[PDB]
Design a protein around this motif. Structure first.
Motif, PDB file in Angstrom:
ATOM      1  N   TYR A 206       0.803  -1.221   0.000  1.00  0.00           N
ATOM      2  CA  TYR A 206       0.000   0.000   0.000  1.00  0.00           C
ATOM      3  C   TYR A 206       0.838   1.275   0.000  1.00  0.00           C
ATOM      4  O   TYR A 206       2.042   1.174   0.114  1.00  0.00           O
ATOM      5  CB  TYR A 206      -0.992  -0.022   1.173  1.00  0.00           C
ATOM      6  N   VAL A 207       0.207   2.451  -0.182  1.00  0.00           N
ATOM      7  CA  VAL A 207       0.860   3.748  -0.435  1.00  0.00           C
ATOM      8  C   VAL A 207       0.066   4.805   0.324  1.00  0.00           C
ATOM      9  O   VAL A 207      -1.128   4.970   0.060  1.00  0.00           O
ATOM     10  CB  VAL A 207       0.869   4.159  -1.932  1.00  0.00           C
ATOM     11  N   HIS A 208       0.738   5.555   1.218  1.00  0.00           N
ATOM     12  CA  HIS A 208       0.078   6.540   2.090  1.00  0.00           C
ATOM     13  C   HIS A 208      -0.565   7.687   1.294  1.00  0.00           C
ATOM     14  O   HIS A 208      -0.028   8.121   0.272  1.00  0.00           O
ATOM     15  CB  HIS A 208       1.032   7.080   3.158  1.00  0.00           C
ATOM     16  N   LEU A 209      -1.734   8.161   1.763  1.00  0.00           N
ATOM     17  CA  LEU A 209      -2.546   9.141   1.032  1.00  0.00           C
ATOM     18  C   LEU A 209      -1.865  10.511   0.863  1.00  0.00           C
ATOM     19  O   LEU A 209      -1.995  11.138  -0.195  1.00  0.00           O
ATOM     20  CB  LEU A 209      -3.905   9.308   1.722  1.00  0.00           C
ATOM     21  N   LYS A 210      -1.143  11.001   1.877  1.00  0.00           N
ATOM     22  CA  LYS A 210      -0.657  12.388   1.865  1.00  0.00           C
ATOM     23  C   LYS A 210       0.852  12.499   1.656  1.00  0.00           C
ATOM     24  O   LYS A 210       1.299  13.331   0.864  1.00  0.00           O
ATOM     25  CB  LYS A 210      -1.073  13.108   3.165  1.00  0.00           C
TER      26      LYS A 210
END
Ligand code: MG
Length: 261
Positions: A206-210
């Motif tokens: 996964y990849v963080h939103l901000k």
RNA sequence: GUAUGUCUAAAGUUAUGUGCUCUUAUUUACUAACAAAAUCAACAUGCUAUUGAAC
């Protein structure tokens, strides 16, 4: 040893320390060992995001209400929002379960059996709604310790969850809030999660939103495996252990993220 | 294509003022002018992800 205050998120602290009317007196507060400037400013940013704090840095009435819960501000935000959204009843027990360490027991050789017992309570959406199913089944077994052991769940954790639920219910009845149930419309809870956890979001590689850093589901998650992959994610904590892990995982729709923030 | 250069052995003085014995290159091996434009013969028959102390 470095004091805890110099090395932990402080947003519960700053919320309370604004709630008692220590103002920019907080911004200059006499601790023995002052927390790092960026820690303070980040906790301020978090509170500003949640709407506990204005652009000057001063407490909002939402802030003061949240501070009367014994909670990190996200978990009070989500309970207050769960009133208006109409899921307070489920939100109480889920927020209760989210407070508690070591809810499931996973001894050295028995990883399969521990998970198999947990998976009898599985919700395909999330860890968060799987916690609901655990507490419901625990109660349906008359809160049995032997059922707890059979299903590899820590009874200490469950009794503490119920003690927290009754305390939070008392705090809500002190704030005169109604304890509305959403029933099977569990998406109402997931909408409430977006009100509290909009920073704590990620998207599949996964990849963080901000910040955009890549991150992983913790292998205990109902959503982890050589298997499942929901596209958009909200989470209870990010934590580096052996890997940069989301501690437990809930699926989300992106429209809710700009709805709530 | 295994560079090449210089040196010296000269003459004495040119008349005045046999044992023993190793060796499956155990060699200090030496020369580069010669040639350099290398690719048929490739490659297995089908792609993966895993664990936190404590309050
Ligand atoms: Mg020549």
């Amino acid at each position: 040893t470095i004091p805890e205050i110099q090395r932990t998120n402080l947003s519960n602290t700053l919320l309370l320390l604004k709630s008692l009317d220590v103002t920019d007196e907080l911004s200059k507060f006499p601790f023995i060992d002052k927390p790092p400037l960026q820690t303070f400013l980040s906790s301020l940013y978090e509170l500003w995001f949640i709407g506990a704090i204005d652009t000057s840095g001063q407490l909002t009435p939402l802030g003061l209400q949240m501070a009367k819960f014994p909670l990190q501000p996200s978990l009070s935000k989500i309970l207050l929002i769960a009133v208006r959204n109409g899921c307070s009843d489920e939100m109480l027990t889920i927020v209760s379960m989210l407070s508690v360490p070591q809810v499931f027991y996973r001894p050295k050789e028995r990883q399969k059996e521990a998970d198999i017992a947990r998976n009898k309570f599985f919700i395909a959406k999330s860890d968060h709604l799987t916690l609901l199913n655990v507490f419901e089944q625990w109660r349906a077994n008359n809160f049995s310790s032997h059922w707890c052991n059979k299903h590899f769940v820590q009874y200490k954790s469950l009794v503490r969850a119920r003690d927290i639920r009754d305390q939070l219910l008392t705090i809500l009845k002190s704030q005169k809030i109604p304890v509305i149930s959403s029933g099977k419309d569990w998406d109402i809870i997931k909408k409430c999660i977006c009100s509290g956890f909009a920073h704590q979001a990620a998207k599949i590689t996964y990849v963080h939103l901000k910040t955009g850093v890549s991150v992983q589901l913790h292998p205990t998650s109902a959503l982890h495996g050589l298997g499942d992959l929901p596209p958009y994610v909200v989470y209870h904590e990010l934590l580096m252990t052996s890997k940069e892990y989301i501690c437990c995982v809930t699926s989300v729709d992106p429209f809710w993220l700009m709805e709530y923030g």
